[PDB]
Design a binder for this molecule. Structure first.
Ligand code: FMN
Ligand code: FMN
Lengths: 351, 350
């Protein structure tokens, strides 16, 4: 086994439990870090002070390194006319549940690039690792984090995005293949999505690049981890494998969805949030290019609209609109305390 | 594992993929003589011409080889749809001073619609017969197995791997999204799950009955080792053999795959009517874009494209060529096929 990543992070095992906004928790992160991996939390969507309190919660439960994740998308551009047309299109769905769409949509997830309170807070709290999704911060901000001993990780979905992660000065690249659950890390989705599978992406980044590569997407057991290291990865990041952990904040309907037959087929959708994301298809996965569908508002305003519909639906016992993200290996998902899943993966990695 | 090797009577768990228009009897023999499983594709040829190709392979090797056929839902003619398609293409043909064919032909008969292929295979008896786009009716997998032939079927999903199993094929070729050339989806009007090799191979090895041949993105022995770790019994590699001098890739295609265009592949349905992965060019356009008419069936669309390729090529223009390649294309190497095979085996052990 290579120590290129474990050395870097000061951990025992080359396994990262994916940050998963709405699913990871301080209990989940601490569990994995205490078992010898790198546990993770996502803090986007919170005030800096509330992210601070979440970082301190994890520190309260583990003395080991953990990872704090922030979204670094292009800041969403409000478009009130486009947003009104979208809301009008969604009216019949709200009406099914005796609800009306919201009157206005909000930028619910501020990017690291538009919230200047986040960097100073992280320079104070100094978690072991800070990770970025959807883009890379400027090199001088990455270096400010490293000057205080924080390791910086950034997700890339292509070699061209991996070149940008290198130019930002990150410590490692998270190579997110098509198999991955949740939002695709594509930097500029208006330019398309190469939709490179994990087996090819990890090989290309390890064969033709020199930052340490963390493989992310479809990995559910030790055979998958061993395959990723054979491709040249220095570590793995696994999200869907940790969703059934009892430490996770997945709800009962999501656990049921993932343990059941729907796990056999995932799909990508832009209509849930405004950005391409993979999960178990439902009534929120519709064809945005069908006749009569108006133009999609920007991320994350579309997600604000969806969350109000999810609220209205859940207020009538209906879970057909929920965000139940999941990777293409979802049918191999197991339910176990995170620290024992972690140890099971290690035994399988070495078995 | 030697699940697969013993079964096929070969030394090495490496299949050089059948690639219509790229694989040749010389390529297949080189790989078979070096210890893997060489392959040829015979769809699109009369049964007698297929027989002549099998005999060409046997002229160069007496080791096991694989003979591939397309098992797609047979194409359905729709004259008005075809006429509007050819109309839309008209200005392209015009740029090279030609115009479209008047009608379009079912240039590639599925195994399902050409009753002469099965009799022809029962006599010639290659070691393996493989099918793409679908699983043949079960009695026939039986009929080939009856006479000593191993039957392989490509699938792109666990659901399609079921349909292969019930068919009692001997092995399933698990084709990930990384794969070059035409996607093996059975029923594309029904959608495309577009599953990556890493997930598909693990799913089929953990949940299915058959030896799994991993296909898509594998370019070196590390990729081979990875596939075996995921539970595959062997690999099938197409893009890695395209640069072999034994292939029938033309010079333009070789230069395209060696150059910077290998950094990015894409899927198109506008080249043939079915989703296929290669180096994008002027045949890779958005079929849903304003002004583009409904697409005709596979393989009729390919018939129109071949016509336009013939016309561009007469003017020395290669921008409409079919230059298929997988997502590992940037790792392509140019070696004699047997030397590639030896290098892969070395890497698989190192
Ligand atoms: C439920 C879920 C939520 C996700 N949310 C985020 C997140 O908040 N931030 C992030 O960096 N990645 C997120 N991801 C993606 C993961 O970081 C990682 O790319 C992905 O889980 C890997 O694929 P796998 O799920 O097949 O393991 C999400 C993934 C899932 C499954
Ligand atoms: C140039 C080329 C032509 C292809 N044509 C066919 C074909 O005729 N028959 C078939 O079963 N598969 C065909 N394929 C698909 C391969 O069998 C296989 O799934 C693919 O090569 C695997 O990915 P790789 O190219 O990344 O190795 C072809 C692929 C390539 C690259």
């Amino acid at each position: 086994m290579t120590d290129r990543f474990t050395r870097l992070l000061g951990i025992q095992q080359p396994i990262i439990q994916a940050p998963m906004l709405g699913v990871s928790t301080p209990a989940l992160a601490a569990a994995v870090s205490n078992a010898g991996g790198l546990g993770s939390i996502a803090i986007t969507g919170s005030a800096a002070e509330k992210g601070r309190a979440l970082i301190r919660e994890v520190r309260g439960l583990t003395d080991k390194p953990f990872n704090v994740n922030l979204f670094c998308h292009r800041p969403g551009q409000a478009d009130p006319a486009r947003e009104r047309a979208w809301l009008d299109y969604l009216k019949p769905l709200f009406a099914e549940f005796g609800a009306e769409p919201p009157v206005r949509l909000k930028n619910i997830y501020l990017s690291f690039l538009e919230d200047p309170t986040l960097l100073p807070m992280l320079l104070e709290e100094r978690p072991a690792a800070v990770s970025f999704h959807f883009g890379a911060p400027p090199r001088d901000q990455v270096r400010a984090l490293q000057a205080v001993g924080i390791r910086v990780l950034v997700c890339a979905t292509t070699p061209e995005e991996a070149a940008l992660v290198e130019a930002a000065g990150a410590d490692a690249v998270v190579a997110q293949g098509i198999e991955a659950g949740g939002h695709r890390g594509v930097f500029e989705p208006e330019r398309g999505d190469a939709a490179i599978g994990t087996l090819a992406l990890v090989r290309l980044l390890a064969a033709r690049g020199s930052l340490p590569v963390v493989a992310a997407g479809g990995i559910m057991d030790g055979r998958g981890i061993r395959a990723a290291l054979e491709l040249g990865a220095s570590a793995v990041q696994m999200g869907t494998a940790f969703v059934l952990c009892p430490e996770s904040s997945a709800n009962a309907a999501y656990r049921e969805a993932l343990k059941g037959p729907r796990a056999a087929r995932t799909a990508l959708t832009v209509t849930m949030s405004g950005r391409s994301a993979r999960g178990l298809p439902n009534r929120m996965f519709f064809d945005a290019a069908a006749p009569g569908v108006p133009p999609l508002p920007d991320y994350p305003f579309v997600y604000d609209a969806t969350k109000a519909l999810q609220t209205a639906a859940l207020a009538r016992g209906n879970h057909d609109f929920a965000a139940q993200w999941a990777g293409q290996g979802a049918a191999l998902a197991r339910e176990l305390p995170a620290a024992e899943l972690l140890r099971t993966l290690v035994e399988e990695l070495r078995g």
